[PDB]
Amino acid sequence: NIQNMSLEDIMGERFGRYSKYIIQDRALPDIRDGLKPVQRRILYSMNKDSNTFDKSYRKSAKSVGNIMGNFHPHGDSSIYDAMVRMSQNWKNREILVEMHGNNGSMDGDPPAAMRYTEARLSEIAGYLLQDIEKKTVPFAWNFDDTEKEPTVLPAAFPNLLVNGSTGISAGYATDIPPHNLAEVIDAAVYMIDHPTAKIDKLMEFLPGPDFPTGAIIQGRDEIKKAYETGKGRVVVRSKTEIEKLKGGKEQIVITEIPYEINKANLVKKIDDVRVNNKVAGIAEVRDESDRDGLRIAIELKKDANTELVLNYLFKYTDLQINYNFNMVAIDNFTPRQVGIVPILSSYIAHRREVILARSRFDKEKAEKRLHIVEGLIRVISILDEVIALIRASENKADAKENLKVSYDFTEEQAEAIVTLQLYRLTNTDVVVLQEEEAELREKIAMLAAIIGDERTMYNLMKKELREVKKKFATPRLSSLE
Amino acid sequence: NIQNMSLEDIMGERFGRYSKYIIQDRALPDIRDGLKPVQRRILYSMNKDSNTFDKSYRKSAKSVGNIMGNFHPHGDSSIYDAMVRMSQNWKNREILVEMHGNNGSMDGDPPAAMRYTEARLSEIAGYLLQDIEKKTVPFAWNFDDTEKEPTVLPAAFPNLLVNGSTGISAGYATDIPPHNLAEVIDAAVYMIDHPTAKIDKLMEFLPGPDFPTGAIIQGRDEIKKAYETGKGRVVVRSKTEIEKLKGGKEQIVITEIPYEINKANLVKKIDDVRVNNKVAGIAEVRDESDRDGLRIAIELKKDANTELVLNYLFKYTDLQINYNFNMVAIDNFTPRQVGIVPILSSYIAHRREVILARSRFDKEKAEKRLHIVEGLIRVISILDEVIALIRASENKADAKENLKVSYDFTEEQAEAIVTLQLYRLTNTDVVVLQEEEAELREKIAMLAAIIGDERTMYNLMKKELREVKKKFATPRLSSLE
Amino acid sequence: KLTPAQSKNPAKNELYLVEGDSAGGSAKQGRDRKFQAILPLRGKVINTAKAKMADILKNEEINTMIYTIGAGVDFSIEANYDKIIIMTDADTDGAHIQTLLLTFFYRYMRPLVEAGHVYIALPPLYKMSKKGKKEEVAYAWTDGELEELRKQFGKGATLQRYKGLGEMNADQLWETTMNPETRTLIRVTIEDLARAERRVNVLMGDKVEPRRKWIEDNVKFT
Amino acid sequence: KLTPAQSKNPAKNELYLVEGDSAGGSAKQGRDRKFQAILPLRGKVINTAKAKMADILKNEEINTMIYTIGAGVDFSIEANYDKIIIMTDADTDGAHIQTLLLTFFYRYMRPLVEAGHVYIALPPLYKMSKKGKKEEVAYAWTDGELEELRKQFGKGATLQRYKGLGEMNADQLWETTMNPETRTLIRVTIEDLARAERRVNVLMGDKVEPRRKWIEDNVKFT
DNA sequence: GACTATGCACG
DNA sequence: CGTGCAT
DNA sequence: AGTCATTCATG
DNA sequence: CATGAAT
Ligand SMILES: Cc1c(N2CC[C@@H]([C@H](C)N)C2)c(F)cc2c(=O)n(N)c(=O)n(C3CC3)c12
Ligand SMILES: Cc1c(N2CC[C@@H]([C@H](C)N)C2)c(F)cc2c(=O)n(N)c(=O)n(C3CC3)c12
Ligand SMILES: [Mg+2]
Ligand SMILES: [Mg+2]
């Protein structure tokens, strides 16, 4: 009982392990469904556990215990917090979890414990999971080796671009900003038709992001470079209005702040500019925001240096921030830095494989029912003989053999026949059967088209994408200058 | 929008609510299964969720999320801690939860979080739940009104006396010490035969408790009064040995301490007697306990005042404690103070109702199969006619009517007949059927005996109790003086 | 620590005593901060009828309550809010904190209640909703109200039986139990003195034997 | 805070550095307290290669480690244990803490390793059991060992794939990874110096760009 | 149920 | 300084 | 993941 | 000062 290993050979391997798992399976998004494993396990579990948006909300602690015991071998705090985030309209552009209770706020406060809250998945999240039950996607075993897990979701829209991601692993980081579902789908779609799409044209549809907190974004020149290379610096400015106050007084009102900034603290920093008297127009600073509205009123004194003051704040507080594009996702099991183009194409190809796989699944299911139906049809023409023969036999398997040797049915045909209950004998109508057969055969033709006819396939892809667009679209919140 | 209520009328009602729920549904044991609702919900949920002792252990957080979301409307900490306790061989005499990982110790340390541990129910716990699936016991709706919950378990042994309980509610408290499963069952059994059992005779079988930490118990006179009235003071002394040390030195060794005392702290208090030099034989105090053994060695100096010293410690530290009987359980929905007798009788009657209810359940199930079987038998004699008639009909229900009007079968008979699959036609043997019919009828006779024949019923009760005794019995750990 | 109100006005300023940090958070979120304060009670409140004076003054909740309202405990009066409103879960444990709070108020801040400044707030017991983007929810506070609602929403509509304040959002909290124009409050008066002092002492008191009888005679265990 | 050993003997005294308070608890439970100490590491350890000196000395874990072993950090030597043994989960995060610990030891306590006093302990990866009162469990640490075990236990026996130290008891911890006669330990030697200092710096270092290449060139992402 | 230190990359 | 999944 | 206060009865 | 289900 003793081993010798060098310090050199230990560190390399250990760090190797950690870096790997942290790079792939913890911190980085899949470029396809734009999910990190915790998120995906959350969606997948809540969904499997019929915790859909259309049914009653359910006790967060239950959701997590289930995720933790079945899929995600880590801390409940990690699972829960990540759950909570997905419930946050300000952080995500299309929230994927609905949570009842205190799930935090912009003023930065602490979400209530999983023991107080209740959650279900959202509506749009079902879309990511769409078709998962039709063998559309690669499954793995859970750590228990007791249950299987999707490595990726069917992703009925481009969540990666829409919701974004951040973003700290080993050797890489990732920051990706939210984007307008509608806009992104329009880009996606174009690229489907014209694959060799140049960035400039794609920019026409998808031009700059869309932060859930809205606000003003300037850096067209910069957004281009981001969408191109992957890295970019763009400028984000809260949205400003002027209000006039009875008494030769002027108020500066703010109704949108830059993505990912702490309204509670931002306010304190502004009042701090005033007390430490670092500018002239310092008067009163008031945060008057209630549910259903964000309003920050900074009122001035008499020498209304308004333009000077706002402009000062723009530099010296975070009322104006700078945002960074570091678009790093996992493609072919490895970290890649990427721009609108790869993040789009990878998506498309994914939907392709999904759609094909789905169709292959649907066709088989059909051809199997067709096969049984064809037999059911023959059986009717000899019903009397067949029944007598089942009676003659000695066991279930024996009858199945006799049907097969005698009348040349198949296995699957014999089995369906023999399990027929008695009341089914009540209706022996060649006609109704033949109608179903007809439908099955049109279904199969159609499927077989999407499978071996790339153009029609890409067509279906676009149809679905558009459908998702109409259902879920909403107007921009961020403005571009 | 405004109401007026007095302070007098508010307090009474509010306190009423709280006191009630705290007295019944939180802090106090049911005199029958000896459970508090959290415990019972834990057992019931883990069990329903197939988390039995014979299958793999499962991630505590999962167990609790499930309990919390489905049954117990309270804090996970409360649910979990109570779970942990049930996993504790020193606190309970027959642990009802098996937990993997750090579930605490006697040295008083903090059990690991539910996010680290894994648990399943124990083996003996299945016994409390035994027969629950055979309508043996009163069910209620969960708070969601989505699922039903046992208000009491079938309780295949007298857990109330065996594991005990404490014990703090509103207006009442309860303290009950553990007892030897074997001994208690012997008492129970006697009382079944001789109902009007006097305490003195019952004491012969069940004489004094049995703490899992073993030790010495003195107070026969007192144990009598406890078992009689419900209240009692008994004396508990750790178990002491003398060891001789090369050098004219003497060591005092302790290998059992009184129920519910913190070995880590007890040790500190003893070393404290030494440093504060409150007695003469003060030398070194050492706790040398490792897994699989409790050993406390207090070694002396030269003037081996051994008898004087131990005796001093006996008063002035907790090496000797006093234990209190305050036996308060819930009978007929209300708090009652009680002694061996009521806690026994209530149990018996409970097993009675359970057993009868169980039998009623089993008999019905049988008579229903008998009824179908009798029909299956007739159908065979007319198989050919019947089949042709099912073919004639127009739907499932129509065939069922025709069988009923024509051949005078019943509903349940028609239904079983018509759902028969085709392969069943493979074997039309009046004989095998008649054999089953024969068994069913002997089963029913037997059941109907236990139902309407109190003596045989009480007999079955005793048989089962004895069986449980052999399986689960173990020798005493506490000694009586 | 207390979450204050932007303005100082004893004419119409509300002090909310909430059961638990988490619910208080939700409270701070939805609310008119121009004149209402959230002050959370981090767990089960000191029994100011079964605890010496030393302990009471040392208790974090109580002190914060005292210094935030101003008057003192003798007590003096108007500072500092013209409503002290108690917001707890509608459960047994919630009821218990109401007991504990009014005991304190009754004993020390006694004028406050007499002037009718102490209120208890009635969160809804039920939410009725009839899927997704088009979903409708209404609220009920009683046995009978739900009947009316169920008929209105008729078959197909799901009922939720709120287990605590944590189960509802800030907008929801506003609409039902905070917004002056929609809220339904209880107002504690006292309709004697002595009847009260006996009740408060028997229940909240250091005795037990009497509490037990009270419970025997009064708590109906069916 | 540290859980000490009854006796003082630098000849054969073990210092266990455990990943997490909870596992440490289990560690303190099963063990020969006559000569082995548990000292838990409350979460992810300071990067003593990517943190100024001020921070390092201020870090609770590190200081406690330093004062408990004695020597210092210069370092001096024998005080105070004749084995420093690192016990972590067998997972990626466990491996990460091993990285962080040897970095520190390598950089500051460098003689300790050279004298071969630093060990890593190998908890089992698998438990094999074949119901209830009669149940049999055996342990495996590798791909191949489990093969041998599965054949022995043959069909019907269930396998457990330990996800961490928390999943096992104190008796179990003793038998497999603590009891000198049954434990299997790794002993860190260093087979150069410079090769080491480069590896330790590229990996654990304040640079990144190099770490990234190391990962590109070395981390096989299949 | 708040607080409290950490890694990991980056501006 | 702070991000967000991990300890 | 330790710590920290509190209720409720009782020796 | 604890105990053990609650906050
Ligand atoms: C320990 C520990 C901390 N501490 C306590 C003191 C200090 C230690 C000395 N490093 C840092 C700390 F400051 C925060 C956490 C924490 O947030 N979450 N979610 C946790 O699960 N843990 C535990 C590691 C599992 C925490
Ligand atoms: C708040 C609070 C405490 N505190 C912190 C300080 C003091 C406050 C001021 N009353 C009491 C405290 F000291 C312990 C707990 C606690 O153990 N468990 N399981 C909890 O859930 N909570 C919260 C009530 C829900 C606790
Ligand atoms: Mg509650
Ligand atoms: Mg781990």
Side-chain angles (χ1 to χ4, degrees), chain B residues 30 34 64 69 77 79 98 132 144 298 334 353 359 388 412 433 445 461:
Chain B
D30 188 89
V64 170
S77 36
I79 305 172
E98 304 197 327
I132 203 185
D144 265 6
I298 317 186
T334 84
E353 283 293 353
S359 301
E412 18 285 323
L433 281 187
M461 250 208 49

Side-chain angles (χ1 to χ4, degrees), chain A residues 357-363 365-367 369-384 386-389 391-393 395-400 402-403:
Chain A
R358 183 229 279 147
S359 303
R360 268 177 252 116
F361 179 79
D362 271 336
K363 178 146 94 84
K365 187 186 180 184
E367 309 158 314
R369 179 64 182 171
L370 218 196
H371 187 70
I372 286 174
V373 166
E374 303 169 340
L376 282 196
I377 277 166
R378 280 211 311 155
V379 154
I380 286 180
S381 80
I382 55 194
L383 228 206
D384 279 316
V386 161
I387 286 176
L389 170 150
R391 273 174 76 146
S393 302
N395 62 54
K396 171 172 149 158
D398 198 48
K400 298 176 50 174
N402 289 337
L403 293 155

Side-chain angles (χ1 to χ4, degrees), chain A residues 114-133 136-180 182-197 199 203 205-215 217 219 222 226-232 234-236 238-239 247-249 254-259 262 264-267 270 274-275 277 280-281:
Chain A
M114 78 181 167
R115 92 182 169 183
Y116 292 99
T117 63
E118 293 200 320
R120 64 181 174 212
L121 286 185
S122 75
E123 178 163 27
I124 189 157
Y127 278 88
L128 299 181
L129 302 146
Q130 156 176 296
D131 288 336
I132 202 185
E133 71 288 346
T136 48
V137 128
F139 265 84
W141 287 102
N142 64 147
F143 47 67
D144 265 6
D145 279 84
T146 71
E147 186 149 22
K148 288 192 161 175
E149 214 196 319
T151 69
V152 61
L153 310 181
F157 68 86
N159 179 39
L160 205 209
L161 271 173
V162 167
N163 271 332
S165 191
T166 69
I168 288 179
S169 66
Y172 304 72
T174 192
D175 275 51
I176 309 170
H179 296 68
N180 195 310
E183 302 195 335
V184 172
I185 316 216
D186 290 333
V189 183
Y190 186 81
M191 226 195 87
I192 299 146
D193 283 330
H194 318 100
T196 40
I199 280 200
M203 283 280 274
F205 309 105
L206 213 202
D210 192 14
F211 302 93
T213 44
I217 303 195
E222 274 293 359
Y227 285 20
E228 176 61 308
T229 73
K231 264 157 153 275
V234 91
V235 149
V236 188
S238 46
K239 186 211 204 160
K249 267 180 138 62
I254 311 165
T255 48
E256 275 171 12
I257 60 193
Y259 191 60
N262 198 302
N265 287 129
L266 196 217
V267 160
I270 298 171
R274 192 195 55 62
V275 145
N277 202 242

